[PDB]
Structure formats: structure tokens, C-alpha cells
Amino acid sequence: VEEDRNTNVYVSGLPPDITVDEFIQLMSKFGIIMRDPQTEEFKVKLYKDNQGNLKGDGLCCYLKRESVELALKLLDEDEIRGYKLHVEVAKFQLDYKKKLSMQQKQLDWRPERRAGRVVIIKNMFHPMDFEDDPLVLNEIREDLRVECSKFGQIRKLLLFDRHPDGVASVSFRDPEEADYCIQTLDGRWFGGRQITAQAW
Amino acid sequence: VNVFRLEMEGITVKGKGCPKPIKSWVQCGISMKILNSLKKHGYEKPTPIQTQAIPAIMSGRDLIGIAKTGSGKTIAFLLPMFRHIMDQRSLEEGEGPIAVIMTPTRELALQITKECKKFSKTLGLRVVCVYGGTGISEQIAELKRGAEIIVCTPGRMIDMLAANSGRVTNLRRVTYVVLDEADRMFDMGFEPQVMRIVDNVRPDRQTVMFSATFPRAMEALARRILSKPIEVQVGGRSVVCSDVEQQVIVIEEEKKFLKLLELLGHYQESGSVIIFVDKQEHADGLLKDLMRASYPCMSLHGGIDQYDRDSIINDFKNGTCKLLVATSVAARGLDVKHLILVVNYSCPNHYEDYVHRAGRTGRAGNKGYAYTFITEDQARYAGDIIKALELSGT
RNA sequence: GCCGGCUAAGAUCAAGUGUAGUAUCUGUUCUUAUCAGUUUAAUAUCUGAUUCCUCGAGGA
């Protein structure tokens, strides 16, 4: 039924030594390639023979139709190093809104510039408590990891067992989670001592 | 006739001679002051841990309750104790409390004293006002004027017992021994203080323990101090089996047959499976649709004869029938080794039928698969299914 | 927006997600009340004080 609004392009003929990455570069030269919403792996297909043999044909779907008409009048009858490619509107014969909106936001025109995620915790432990207790440091590290996991995805967590002030570093993927952890950890008690939290 | 539905709600109960849980606070055997405090606090429906602990404390037996944080264990320890104090009044002797509550922290002891004062509001009963790290003269002057309950620290209680300020008489002094946060009191740090507190006590006195978590060693240490304890946690009574994997999918009523055909076609769920249905006519229609789809299937329901149901059960046990459709009558009591998969296409109205359908496959320590289709009409059973999945660990 | 109203007109306090940045969502609550001070262009905000009716319970 859908005559136009077809964002799929069919690459007739290709070098039999074509990889996927060179192909997706060829196709990304002409716009954004639509990505499968449930996963990664842009919606690009390399048609293959009954074996590892490469038939030499390729499919690529695009986010928009203007990129298809761009590839039509710029890739057709153009030579890669050895071979002559052919480009045609793909023929077919026989969660959603979230990632749709994300791929759309990839075309934004939002303001850039600006400023252009690590929380430091102090007064949490002491080196004198770890001298006669070898399992207290690991339990304190597990408690700090369980406290930092509730605020966000912790990418790196370190505890200085030789620092007299009890320095600990929690590096997360987002600075907002680190700011929330610093706001929730400032003034709180841990092991009978008042621990402080600051940004980095 | 709905006494089993209160136990299926998910409250593991263990012990001999356990009373029935109360549905509301108005019919729980409480006094007028406890009911007035419950009406003033705004409690419309009681907690299940409170409904399991209040008859066990009103009967006079030792109880050990475990629940989540913020479930109302302090009110569940204060309300039946105050109800038994108001119903069975005794002479307020000098330097002797009628209840002993042990708290590991001073702030927790102050919160327990505030909860006991709120539960005993609009009455002349003042329990205690004492904490560690404060002046002992003010605490002795507060305890000398009369003490109903004793909610304080074990160190302050040991200091009061050593200085002859508060002790338990032999004949009749206290009838209830409360223990808030019993996991910390049964540890190595608070072991001799709790031992000296439990040693100098009356022989005829109940022991109550409440904590958020309870290890095996702490429970084994706490069971020696009590006399015939009753355990109360969640979930065990009428709960699902942990060996059988439970899966819940959100599908429509017409898409359930397509999901069953996709599970029978793509996955290996067609052979050696039991399919639960709602009615007998729907089970017969599902069996006819499975037989029309080139799949050997048998049916067993109340509409069929007994000989045909026995032949279908023999074909399902021997391996002649790949799938067996059954009603809710065959969900409980049936012990078939060939039933490895349990497909609940129609969700029952009660959680006991779903627990019996999940427990029918993968028994005697063996593994099993249980896939249930949840629809929009079974919104009342979704909370019971979530509670069963939280109790079974799914 | 529809023919003055149907509480989509505002503020706020906790938590989650995420960005270089802006942000997005859930629970909420919203004083239904008075006086004094702070403050605001004015609000706002904050700082303190303040027995009767009905059928053991509820409301003021």
C-alpha cells in the first residue's frame, strides 16, 4: 500500500570482499541510519549465498526519505575502488515511541557550549579499625557499594585504607547521580561517625 | 469459611496450637483504650504481621515475628500487651514493671516509649521515661512513681538491677518480655547483657521477639530462651514452590491461545505439559483446538466421564498424550512425574489454586516450569501473584 | 480548549532516569483556619502564639 515513504535502499552489486563496516560507512555518508529500537546494530543487511560466499547485494534502511533520495543521485553509477555499484529503492515481495523520539532527537539544533561525576566521601572509616579486623574493610566497601548502587550506576568505587581521614571515591556514569549521592550522604552517620560528602 | 484465605495471604506460621488471625482490630480481643488509640491513629486495616502476632500474644504464648521494615512491629508488640494489661489488671508494686522491652539503641527505645505512650493515650498508665547516657536520678525518680512497661537499653537495665532500682520478683512481677531488634540482641556484642536480663526474670512470663532480619544461628539462640515459641514470617503457609520457575506474561484474552500455540510450536512446551483452564467447556474447546492443530492432546474435567478422565490420565502418564488440559479440581492432589510444564492460560480467582497449579509440576526437589498468562480482568489476584513471586524468589 | 464553569491556570518537598547543558516521570501535600515579625512592587514564603452536634465512633 505504502508507495512512497520508503526509507529502504537497495544496493545492487558490490565487491565480493565487502565488510559490514565499510558498507555502513558508505551508507552513513548520506545520513543517519535507522537503528533497531529494541537493540543496537543499525538496520543494515548483507545478503549472503547458501554459504559464507558474498552475493554482493546490500540493503540499508534510513531514518528519513530525503537521505534515500540523496543516495539515489550521489551513489548510483559511482565506483568504489574496484566495482560499480547500483542504487535503487528497495523492493519487498512475497519501546517504539521511546527510541523513535531518541533517533529524532539526534537531529536537534539544541544549544551546545556550557561547562563541557565523582563523589568524595570522608570521615567514613579509620586505618586503626582495619589493623585488628581484616574483614571490616571489605564489609565497609560492600556497604558503600550497596549505598552507591541505589543512587545510580556506579562505574568505579575505591576506598583508601591508608588515608587518615577515610577518603573514598565513587565515580558514576552521570553527575546527577553523584550529586544525589553527595546530597544523601552529607550529614549521614556510618559506623558511629559523621561522614561528609563532596563533589569532584 | 474463608479462614484459609487469611493464611494464603502469605504469612509463614510455625508452631503447635496456633490461634486464628484476626481480620480487624474490633474483633481481636482488645480493650477499649487500645481500640481508641487505633481509631485515633488512623488504622483502618491491621497488618498481617500484627494480625499474626496479636492473638499469639493475647493467648499467653511466646511469639517470634519477622517482617519487613516499617510494617508496624512496635504497635504489634504494644497493643496486645496493653490490652492484656487493661483486661487483666494487677497491683503496681514498687520498682517492678509488668512488661520488659529491650531495645539496642537509645533512639529506638525512645521511639518505642513514644509508641507505647501513643497506644496508651487518654489513660493513667505511664510506662517509662529512661535512656542511656542521661541522668540516672531523673530516671529513678520517673520509675519510682510507677512503671507499667520497661522500654530501655540493656545496659541501663543492668545498671538499674545492680543498684537495686529495678528488678523482677519471683511470684508475680512481669508477664511479657518484649525484644525489639532481636537480631542485634542475639549477637556476640549483646549476649551476656541479654543473658543476665533473661536470667533474672519471672518463670511464668511470656517472651516476645521482633526483628527485620533473622539468621539461623540467632533464631537458634533466641529459641532457647522461649518456651514453645510460635514463628510468624512471610512467606511459607500456602506459598509457591521455589524449585518450580514461575513466569508471568501480560497478554489479552484472545491472544492467550496464540501465545499457547507459539509456546507449543516454537518452544518445547507441547509435549508433557498440563494446561489449566477456567471452565470445563473452555477446556474442551482448547483440547479440540489442540487436536485440530495436529497435536495429540487429552482433556480431563467434570463434564467428561470418570473412565474417559482415567484414560486421559493414563495416556498423559504413559506418554500417549503430549498435552493434558485440566480444570481446577486436578490442580491439587495430582502427583504426576510427566508433568514438567504448567501452562496457566486462565488465571484463577484464588491464589491457592495458582499455588497448587505451580506446585503440581517440579516436586520432590526436582525442577519445573510454570508459565501463567496474566490478563487485565485478574487485577485483584495480581497482588497475590506478586506476593507469591516475592515469597518464592521469582 | 468547550458551551461563568467543569480543579489540565501556580508553588512545593522526597525519590528514580539522563545530558556537555536544558531536563523527564511518580508520590504527594497544598495552608480550606487567625494574629505578630521577616520579606515581596503586591502575593508568596519562613519564623512564633492561639467545648458543641450527630449515631463507644465521626465531624466542627
CB neighbour burial string for A43-75, b if at least 16 within 10 angstroms, e if fewer: bbebeeeeeeebebbbbbbbbbeebbebbeeeb
Amino acid B66 reads I
Q: A110 CA to C6 C1', in Å? A: 39
Radius of gyration in angstroms for the set of CA atoms belonging to chain A, rounded to a whole number: 27
With H, G, I as helix, E, B as strand and everything else as coil, classify residue A173.
Answer: coil
Short-list A64, A74, A69, A65, CA closest to A26: A74
Matching residue, cell 492484656: B84
Question: Do B351 and B381 form a contact (C-beta atoms < 8 A)?
Answer: yes
What letter would DSSP give residue A84? B
Give the whole-angstrom CA distance, residue B180 versus residue B73.
8
Q: A121 CA to C40 C1', in Å? A: 39
- A111: the nucleotide nearest its CA (via C1') is C21
Short-list B146, B106, B102, CA closest to B127: B146
Short-list B136, B187, B126, B182, CA closest to B157: B136
Question: Do A6 and A90 form a contact (C-beta atoms < 8 A)?
Answer: yes
Question: B307 — alpha (psi -120 to 50), left (phi > 0) or beta?
Answer: alpha
Give the whole-angstrom CA distance, residue B207 versus residue B221.
14
Q: Residues B121, B123, B128, B131: is their CA dihedral positive or negative?
A: positive
Q: A64 CA to C16 C1', in Å? A: 34
Protein contacts of strand C with Cβ less than 7 Å away = A 110-116, 150-153, 173-177, 180, 183-184; B 32, 35-36, 39-40
Q: Residues B145, B150, B155, B159: is their CA dihedral positive or negative?
A: positive
CB neighbour burial string for A149-161, b if at least 16 within 10 angstroms, e if fewer: eebbebeebebeb
Burial class (CB in 10 A: 0-12, 13-18, 19+), B44: exposed
Q: B44 CA to C55 C1', in Å? A: 19
Q: CA A42 → CA A34, A38, A59, A62, distances in Å?
A: 6, 11, 11, 9
Question: A8 — alpha (psi -120 to 50), left (phi > 0) or beta?
Answer: beta
Cα–chain center distance at A144? 27
Cα–chain center distance at A87? 31
> Which strands, in side-by-side order, build the sheet including A154-159?
A154-159, A168-172, A118-122, A196-199
Amino acid B193 reads Q
Resolution (A): 2.5
Short-list B125, B340, B354, CA closest to B239: B354
Give the whole-angstrom CA distance, residue B224 versus residue B191.
13
Amino acid B48 reads P
3-class DSSP string for chain B: CCHHHHHHCCCCEECCCCCCCCCCHHHCCCCHHHHHHHHHHCCCCCCHHHHHHHHHHHCCCCEEEECCCCCCHHHHHHHHHHHHHHHCCCCCCCCCCCEEEECCCHHHHHHHHHHHHHHCCCCCCCCCCCCCCCCHHHHHHHHHCCCCEEEECHHHHHHHHHCCCCCCCCCCCCCEEEEECHHHHCCCCCHHHHHHHHHCCCCCCEEEEEECCCCHHHHHHHCCCCCCCEEECCCCCCCCCCCEEEEEEECCCCHHHHHHHHHHHCCCCCCCEEEECCCHHHHHHHHHHHHHCCCCEEEECCCCCHHHHHHHHHHHHHCCCCEEEECCCCCCCCCCCCCCEEEECCCCCCHHHHHHHHHCCCCCCCCEEEEEEECCCCCCCHHHHHHHHHHHCC
Q: A112 CA to C42 C1', in Å? A: 39
Residue B37 cell numbers, joined: 488509640
- A181: the nucleotide nearest its CA (via C1') is C15
Give the whole-angstrom CA distance, residue B29 versus residue B80.
8
Give the whole-angstrom CA distance, residue A93 versus residue B126.
86
Question: Do B270 and B322 form a contact (C-beta atoms < 8 A)?
Answer: yes
- B32: the nucleotide nearest its CA (via C1') is C56
Q: B123 CA to C35 C1', in Å? A: 34
Q: B42 CA to C31 C1', in Å? A: 22
- A180: the nucleotide nearest its CA (via C1') is C15
Technique used? cryo-EM
Residue B233 cell numbers, joined: 514470617
Residue B374's contacts (CB-CB under 8 Å, 6 or more residues apart) are B248, B249, B250, B251, B347, B382, B385
Give the whole-angstrom CA distance, residue B360 versus residue B340.
9
Give the whole-angstrom CA distance, residue A163 versus residue B49.
46
- A114: the nucleotide nearest its CA (via C1') is C21
Q: B37 CA to C51 C1', in Å? A: 22
- A151: the nucleotide nearest its CA (via C1') is C16
Give the whole-angstrom CA distance, residue B320 versus residue B271.
10
Residue A64 cell numbers, joined: 528519513
Q: CA B19 → CA A53, B51, B56, distances in Å?
A: 76, 10, 7
Give the whole-angstrom CA distance, residue A138 versus residue B105.
25
Chain C positions under 7 Å from a protein CB?
15-23, 56-58
By DSSP bridging, strand A196-199 and strand B63-66 are unpaired
Beta bridge partners of B249: B373
Short-list B126, B155, B154, B159, CA closest to B140: B159
Beta bridge partners of B368: B244
Give the whole-angstrom CA distance, residue B296 versus residue A160.
66
Residue B168's contacts (CB-CB under 8 Å, 6 or more residues apart) are B96, B100, B174, B200, B201, B202, B205
Give the whole-angstrom CA distance, residue B328 versus residue B350.
11
C-beta neighbour count of A143 within 10 angstroms: 13
Nearest residue (CA) to C1' of C56: B32
